[PDB]
Every structure is written in structure tokens, then in C-alpha cells.
Amino acid sequence: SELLVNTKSGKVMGTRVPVLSSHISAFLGIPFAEPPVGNMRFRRPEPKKPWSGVWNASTYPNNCQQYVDEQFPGFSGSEMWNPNREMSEDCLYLNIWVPSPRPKSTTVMVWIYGGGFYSGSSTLDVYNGKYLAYTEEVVLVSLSYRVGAFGFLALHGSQEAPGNVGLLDQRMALQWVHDNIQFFGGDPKTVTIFGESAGGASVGMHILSPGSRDLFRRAILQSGSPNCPWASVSVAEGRRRAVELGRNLNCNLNSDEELIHCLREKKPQELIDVEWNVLPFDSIFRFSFVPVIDGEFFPTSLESMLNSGNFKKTQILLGVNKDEGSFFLLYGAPGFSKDSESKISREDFMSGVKLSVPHANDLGLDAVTLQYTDWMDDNNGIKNRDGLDDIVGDHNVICPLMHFVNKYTKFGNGTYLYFFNHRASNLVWPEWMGVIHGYEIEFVFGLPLVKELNYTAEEEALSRRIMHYWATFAKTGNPNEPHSQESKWPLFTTKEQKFIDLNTEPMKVHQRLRVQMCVFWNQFLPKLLNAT
Amino acid sequence: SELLVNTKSGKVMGTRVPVLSSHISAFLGIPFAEPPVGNMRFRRPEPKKPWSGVWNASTYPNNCQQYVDEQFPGFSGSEMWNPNREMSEDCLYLNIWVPSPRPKSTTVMVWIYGGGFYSGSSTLDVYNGKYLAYTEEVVLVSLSYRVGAFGFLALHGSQEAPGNVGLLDQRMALQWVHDNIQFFGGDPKTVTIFGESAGGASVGMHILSPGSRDLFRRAILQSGSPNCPWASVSVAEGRRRAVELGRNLNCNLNSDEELIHCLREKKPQELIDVEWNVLPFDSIFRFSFVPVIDGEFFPTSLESMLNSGNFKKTQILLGVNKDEGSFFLLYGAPGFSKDSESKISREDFMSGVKLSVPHANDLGLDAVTLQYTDWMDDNNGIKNRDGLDDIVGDHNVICPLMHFVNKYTKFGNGTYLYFFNHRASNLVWPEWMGVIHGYEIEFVFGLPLVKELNYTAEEEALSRRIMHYWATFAKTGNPNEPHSQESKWPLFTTKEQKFIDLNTEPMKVHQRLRVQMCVFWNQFLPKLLNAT
Ligand SMILES: *[C@@H]1O[C@H](CO)[C@@H](O[C@@H]2O[C@H](CO)[C@@H](O)[C@H](O)[C@H]2NC(C)=O)[C@H](O)[C@H]1NC(C)=O
Ligand SMILES: *[C@@H]1O[C@H](CO)[C@@H](O[C@@H]2O[C@H](CO)[C@@H](O)[C@H](O)[C@H]2NC(C)=O)[C@H](O)[C@H]1NC(C)=O
Ligand SMILES: *[C@H]1O[C@H](CO)[C@@H](O)[C@H](O)[C@H]1NC(C)=O
Numbered sequence A, B: 001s002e003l004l005v006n007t008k009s010g011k012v013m014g015t016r017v018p019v020l021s022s023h024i025s026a027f028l029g030i031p032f033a034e035p036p037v038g039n040m041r042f043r044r045p046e047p048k049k050p051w052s053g054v055w056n057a058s059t060y061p062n063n064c065q066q067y068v069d070e071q072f073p074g075f076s077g078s079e080m081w082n083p084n085r086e087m088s089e090d091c092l093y094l095n096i097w098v099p100s101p102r103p104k105s106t107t108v109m110v111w112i113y114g115g116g117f118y119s120g121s122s123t124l125d126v127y128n129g130k131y132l133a134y135t136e137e138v139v140l141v142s143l144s145y146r147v148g149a150f151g152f153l154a155l156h157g158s159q160e161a162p163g164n165v166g167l168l169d170q171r172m173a174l175q176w177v178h179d180n181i182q183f184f185g186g187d188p189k190t191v192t193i194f195g196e197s198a199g200g201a202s203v204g205m206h207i208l209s210p211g212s213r214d215l216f217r218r219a220i221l222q223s224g225s226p227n228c229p230w231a232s233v234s235v236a237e238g239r240r241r242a243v244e245l246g247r248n249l250n251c252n253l254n255s256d257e258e259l260i261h262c263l264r265e266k267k268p269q270e271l272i273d274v275e276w277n278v279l280p281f282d283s284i285f286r287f288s289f290v291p292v293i294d295g296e297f298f299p300t301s302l303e304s305m306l307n308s309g310n311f312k313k314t315q316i317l318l319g320v321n322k323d324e325g326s327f328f329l330l331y332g333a334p335g336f337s338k339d340s341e342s343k344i345s346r347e348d349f350m351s352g353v354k355l356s357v358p359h360a361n362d363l364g365l366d367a368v369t370l371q372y373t374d375w376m377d378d379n380n381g382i383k384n385r386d387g388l389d390d391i392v393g394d395h396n397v398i399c400p401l402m403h404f405v406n407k408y409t410k411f412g413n414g415t416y417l418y419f420f421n422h423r424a425s426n427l428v429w430p431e432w433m434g435v436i437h438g439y440e441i442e443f444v445f446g447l448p449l450v451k452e453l454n455y456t457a458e459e460e461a462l463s464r465r466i467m468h469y470w471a472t473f474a475k476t477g478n479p480n481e482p483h484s485q486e487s488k489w490p491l492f493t494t495k496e497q498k499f500i501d502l503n504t505e506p507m508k509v510h511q512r513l514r515v516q517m518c519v520f521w522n523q524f525l526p527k528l529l530n531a532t
């Protein structure tokens, strides 16, 4: 039967699903690790023991335990991001969409969700792989991984809560796809990993990590890179936060053994309820439990790995959205609200700058404020709001990514860079937020092809182009069709540094993406904060 | 007789001179101090002892001893600035142009020449006062003062070479005008002092100095202010340079008495020949012997006098030229030449930055380089040349002056600000130098009214407007005619900060003159260099 597949872990039975007046197969909720519960909470994941009988893979699995956004109850803009299934620590599952009839050996794409390493679900409506699987004839896989303290509590040295176990969950699933995707018609020698925000930084981390590089062929990173300032912490800071977590739950703190045992006795929600209290600063765009630079998963510092070429050499395709900072300002900077235009006063601007660059001394804050202030019109509320947006996006996403691409391109085998700047016509968030991070995802997964979702015709066309760029890059390592007549997305090179805009207008090619601001964030400010 | 005037120092006899098909009186070379020669070299000036008989005031006096620019032998662009009379330490004289018939009590304007405190002459063709005296019916006075070591060698504590004696020479002449200008038809209760570059910083210094403020009514400052970085040094640096001067002449250095005696035995040119060897850094726009912050002429630091309102409160009119830095780059930065367009390479840019901001550590040089570099087009030779021009002009003239006007306006009685950006059609310097500092002077003294000089008609008109703005401001404290129909030069205010452009086009009013760059030079960089 077409819905029955025999894998090395056992038999699995999918389900037929409709998609754009046709059908394909879906194998939802396939287990790839033993449930990380009880004594295994915080531990490295173990492989799933093979099973007898047929695994029913017809419904979505539980989503991992996470903080849930209740900031706007009933607003779809925020709720489309929340877990849409029961939460549970038994959550390590993957989903596969397979063209019908079953391919024999086609290109595979594995999606890694974002969510700041503290949240995220593989089952969100915007992550539904049937449109891309069907339109580009690829086998689409979405995986899951532990988030929050469950995925990233780190007490370096202890083997019970070593840290990075959330990254090892992603890795185990990549191992399972390597070992079994052939039975679903996928070609294991052609898998592309891709993801957004923390999913994009994760992708960059498997490119760096020696233990992960052999499990995939190519990579796509959307608004995230491994060197982002919010994506990793030192073993010492990881340790400090784990102890503070324990102190918030009245744990015995005399040894790692004692702390870990107390944390393992707590219900999931007791951990989620105090998670945010461990941040070292009053900050924006900073998350509590994130990957740790441990000497194992990452052999040395990220920057020294980048400089020395210590990473997988292959082709990459990556980019960012125009307004990366707005979500974070809305939720945590003063003067911003969902239902107003959020014109910012000079006081609120300064407050925002301090929140955006937590680790900066006063000279540093003055350097940032001067770089983004138009002194001929310093009380322009819209300019202050947009300047803050840019400060957050450049410091947290764009410049870190630009630094990664320039370092990578030096040893890589081909880089394609984009700047996504089309705001969706049906976005429910206010206009002032612009092209919000994550809102390029619906176009990558092809939602504009379904009429009832209400996109425009040009939006459906943009979706088809991005899907085909992503799937052609995955199959061949180049997003362009060989002899097509369409205009070409040029390769990004150390010298010319070209990139393309991605929107409903005719492709325009540019050079040196936000160079002015990125020389400030990647060269000057680090130098200013180190000397001073 | 109209050419004979009896002053308190004695009788003086002028000469009738033609001017634009008419005539006026000129009293050239009137002595206002005893010759500062021999033992009086470096000493404060003494009043000129009254004389019997008639002082022949029909020819220009000697110019003070100074370094002479031989960088372009025979080129008029540089030679029109060189001494045009025999040099001599007997040089303290003043010149007066008086309307005919002799006024009874008219507005007086006293010109103080620039020249970096190391050079300058009151007798230059561009400083000829007959055109302004005649056209605006004012009594025009030009004074002289010791420059170089002769005017500014400073060994604070010793009464033989105290420093600032060049400033006291200007002051003595202002005293003589206060006491005698009435006999020439001038009104001593209405004298305006005005000057350019070091002459403009001098004017600002008499506004600050308690011993000078009662000798004049109003002030005009052209491309210079007292707080400029090249206009003063501490008593300790003054001292260091005086000792180094002595060491370059093999002087006995055991006491001030010994050093001073050796320096007094040297011929003038032995001093001028080694003058430049005492600079502490490889620099541009820095001069050896300049005013010293001594606790007498300046009671406390300039910035604390400015902050506390410790200065003469009156009306001021001041401004700058568009391309203040070009002269200094031409003469001392690498890659610039008189007969080429001077496109600058990135190496030469960086060399120039280091020369322009001598006192800066590496982080500081990086801060300047980032602020003036267009990172999307960093090898643009013209952009590098123009950026260097701006760096020199903003740091040395424009921003210091902008800081002075904002501090002054808070306690003053009226400020008028201009931005002169018309390049003269007959300029012999190359195009790349732009509106060169000092080339607004010919328009202030009215040279475009004499046909044989070859200016355009619109240039003659601009000259007439500037002459009338300067002379009306001098007479009334406002450059505008009461009920004229001409557009108005608005007052500069703490809040609106308005200024006007000054050129051959219809007057345009603007606000916050080079604010972006000046917040960098007046607020951020000083803060960066103090912390680091
Ligand atoms: C990616 O790698 C391939 C092969 O490793 C590069 O192609 C080789 O290019 C060199 C120099 O141009 C030739 O000597 C070889 O004959 C090529 N080999 C093959 C199989 O084509 C290719 O240039 C690389 N691409 C990038 C963008 O670096
Ligand atoms: C310059 O000073 C004069 C007088 O010191 C100012 O005029 C006075 O203004 C105050 C308040 O407007 C009035 O009470 C007086 O009657 C005015 N006196 C005279 C003689 O007019 C004038 O405003 C000042 N100008 C500036 C630009 O500060
Ligand atoms: C497993 O899938 C769902 C479970 O909710 C349901 O159709 C049925 O219980 C199972 N299907 C089969 C074929 O066992």
C-alpha cells in the first residue's frame, strides 16, 4: 500500500491528504527518539527503540512544553504561532509529506522551526508541507526539538544536564532521515536543512558542528545565523542561569546532582512560569535557555571556527526580512502598542536603545544613539520608531547574518543572498511593524496558493517563485533554472557581494546589504566596548 | 587741512587716495606702541610716547617678522597673502581710511588679520579699506600685532616672555582707537571688531577677555572662534614649545632668564627658521606659537567661561565658508597637489585622518573614519578627497564655531549666522579646493567693484550686499535695513538656530548648520577620547 512504509525502526502508516485539488501522502508524528521524560529530562536524547506492529502516523504529535503567548487572547496574529496540540515532554516526533505516486529518489527538505529556542511547534498551519511537497515534488520533513529549560538547561561538566540537548534532538532526527528517508522515496544524499530565526541559527549550528555536518547536503537560513547575539551563551552564563532557575523554585543548590534532581521533580509549568526571571539584564530579544559554547557540539568559539574555515563547505541560500525588529519592540519596549502607530518620543527612544543593547556601557549607548539619529529632525516620532526598529533588526539579525555570510563565502561552494521586503496584503498586525520577521514563511510554504486564504494574485505568483527557488536550490545547489529565460539570482561573492530583493516587483540586484550599519555593528562597536 | 589730524599722541598727516572715481583720506602707518625691539622682544607692548611735529602717515608700515610662504613662487594665489612690505620687529602700526568730507561721528570697523597667529599683514591688497570706507561711509581701521614666537612665546610665570603679547598688541590698538578715533570723525562708542581665521578667533578672545571687552561695541567673526583647537594651548604646552625652540637654537636652558636672553640675541630669521620644529605631533592645521590659557588674559578655561556667561554680552555676526579644509590639505596631506584633481586613495585618506586629528587614539581615528566614509563606495577618490576636506573644516572651524554660537546665544543680545558658499569666478586655485577659506574676504572689502579685477556683475552685487550687511550690523547691531523690502536675515536663536547661505542666488534660510557632524565633534568624540 502507498500509505504503508517499512523503516528500520518499524512499519509506519500514513494518510492521504487533499491539496490544491489533488492528493499526497502524509506520515505525521513518527517517533525518532525515546520520550525524554522523568530521569531523562535535560538528558541527551536516545534513539527510539524499534517497534512491532504498525505505527499509526495519521495525526499530528504533541508539541513540546513551552511558554505560550497570551499577550493578545484571540488575535490570530499571535495565536497562529502558539502550540495547536496538547503540550507534553513526550514530543520528539517528525512529519513527512510525500508526493503521490511515491517518488523513488527525490530531493528532501527538512524544516527546523524558530521560536527563540524557548517556543515553537512543527504542526503550525503555516508550516504545513503539503503545498511545497506537492508543487515542487520534494519530500518535505518537519522535525521537533526540546525548547526552553527542557531543551537547553546547561550545567557544563555534569552528564545529566550538559546543555545543547535540544540541538542533539534536531540532530537525531536528521540521523533518522539519513537512515530512513529512502523508504519514503527520498534521496538521503540530497537533503537540505532550512529554518527561520532560531531555526535559521540552528541550521548554521549544524553547519559548524563536526557531529552534524555529514547528515545533510545543503542549507537555507531565514533571518537567523549561528553567531547571532541571542543564540548562544558561555558555559559560565548557562551555569549561572540554571542555578538561578533552581533558586526561583526553592531548590537545594549545593551540588549539580541536587539541583538537577529538584528540577526533575517539578512539573513542566513550574519551570515555564519562572523561565524569564533568569535573564541577566532588562532586555529585548534575549532568551533564557539557548545553545552553550561547550567545547563539544561547538569545538571552539564560533568566531574562531568561522575564521579558520572549521565548518561544512557546501552551498547556502540565506536572507532576511526588511523589518526584523518590530515584533520585539511591540512586546517589550515602552511606547509601542498593537493598535496605535507607535510614534516614539526621544525619551522612549533612549529607553529602547538601552533595552536593545543590554551589554553596552554609556559610551556604547551614545555611539548607537548617534548612528541612528537624524539630528536635523530628532523629535520625529516616526523616525524614532523606525530607527529603533532598525537598531533591533540590524544588531540582532541582519548584521550577524551579514558577518556570517562574508566569513562563510570565503571557504564555501556558493552563496545566494536575499532581502525579502514584501508585506502580505492580509497581515493582521498593524502597518507600523512593516515586513515582520516570520511573515516570509507563509510564502515559502505556499499558503498564497489557497484562495480562501485571501492573498492577491501577485502574492500567489511570488510564492510560486520562492518555492521554486528554494526547491531548485535544494535539488541542485543553485536556485536558478539552467536555461530559463527568467532573470538570474546572481551568486554572492567576496568581491561583488550581490543580493536580490524578493517581492512582487521585477527582480532588482544590489550590493553590500546594510554595509554602513553593519560596519558599525560588526567592526566599530565591538572595538569600542572592548577598549572602554 | 582735511589730511591733518591732531591726536593725543600727536599730529598726523594723511594722504588723499582715489577710489571708484572719487577720493577719501588715508592715514597709513600710525604708531600705537613703542617698537618691541631688543630687550622688549617677547614683552608686553608699551604705549607709544607722544611725538612733536607731524607724523607722515602717507605710506604703509613695515609688516611684522613672519614665516613666508614660498610653496608656489610667483603664483598669485599664495603670494597675495605674503608680506608686501619690508619685514621688521618695528611693526606695531595701524591704518585708517576716512570718508571725505571727514564725518563728525560715524560707525568704526576694526579689522584684525588672520594667518594662524604665525603670519599676516594689515597691508595686503585684499585688506584695502578704501572701498568699504567709501561705499558704506564708515571709518575703517586695520591694526597689526606680533605673530610667531615674537607674538606668542610663553614661559608662564616670567614677566619677560609671559605669552599673549600679540593679543595685547591688538588690545593696545583697540585702546588707541577708543582714545583717538573721534578726531578722525569716528564714534568711539560704536566700534565693531571683525577678522578672519585667527583674526576671527582673536575677536572671540577679546569678547571673552575681561581686559578687552570695554574697548568695542560689537563683533564679527569669519571662520574663526576662540575655542578652535588650533587657537590656544595650556601654559605647560606653551612652556614645552619655548624650551624646544631654545633647544633648536643651542640655547642655555637652565633658567627662564637664560633661555629668554639667548632668544633675544638671535636675529629674527633664526627664530622663524626653526619655528615649525616644536609641534608636538605630525599634524595639519596646528601652529607653534598661539595664545595661552594663562589665568590673566583668560581668567579660567574657555569652556568654563562660555558656560557661565563670563564674557561681553552684545550682538555678534559670524559664519564660515563651505570648504574650510582644502588649503591645509593641499599644503600638508599626502596625495594632494595644486595642479591635479587630487583624487584620494583609501591609504591617503587614512593618512589624512591621522594628520587631521593628531591627538586621537586608534578608536578615535576609527570613529572619525567611519563617520565620513561611504561604505557602499569606499574607493571613490573624489569622495575620499571631499570627506577629508570636510573632516578638516568641521573639526577645525565649523563645529568649534557652531559650539561657540550656541553657548554665546544663550547670554548674548543677538546673533546672525551665515554660510558663505560662492566660489569666486576668477579664483586661480584649482576647482577641487571649492570655496576656500579667506576667499570671502575680497567680497567683504569690496574688490568685485573694481572692473579691472574681473569679477562678474552678480559678484559685484553680492559684494555690495555683504558690505552693507556688515556695515549696517556694525552701525545698528542688525544687518537688515529697518523697512527695506529685501528679504530678511533672521536672528539665530537657541531654539530655531536659523542661518542664511551667502551667494549670488536668492537668500535661502536654513536651520542647524552641520548638526549631524557637529554633534559628533562637539559631544561624542570628546566623550570617546576621555573614557578611552
Ligand atoms: C564548487 O566546487 C566545484 C568542485 O569542487 C568547483 O568546480 C571546479 O572548479 C575548478 C576551478 O574552476 C576546476 O579545476 C574543476 O574542474 C571544477 N570541478 C568540477 C567538478 O566542476 C566550483 O567552482 C565550486 N563553485 C564555487 C562557487 O566555488
Ligand atoms: C537686547 O537687549 C535689549 C535691552 O536690554 C532687549 O530689549 C528689552 O526687552 C525687554 C523684554 O522684551 C523689555 O522689557 C525692554 O523694554 C526692552 N528694552 C529696550 C531698550 O528695548 C532686547 O530684547 C535684547 N535683544 C535680544 C535679541 O536679546
Ligand atoms: C489511528 O488513527 C486514528 C487515531 O485517532 C483513527 O483513524 C484510528 O484509531 C487509527 N487508524 C487505524 C487505521 O488504525
Ligand SMILES: *[C@H]1O[C@H](CO)[C@@H](O)[C@H](O)[C@H]1NC(C)=O
Residues within 6 Å of the ligand: B056, B058, B059
Ligand atoms: C612723507 O611721505 C613720503 C615719504 O616717502 C614723501 O612724500 C615725503 O618724503 C613726506 N611727505 C611730506 C609732506 O613730508
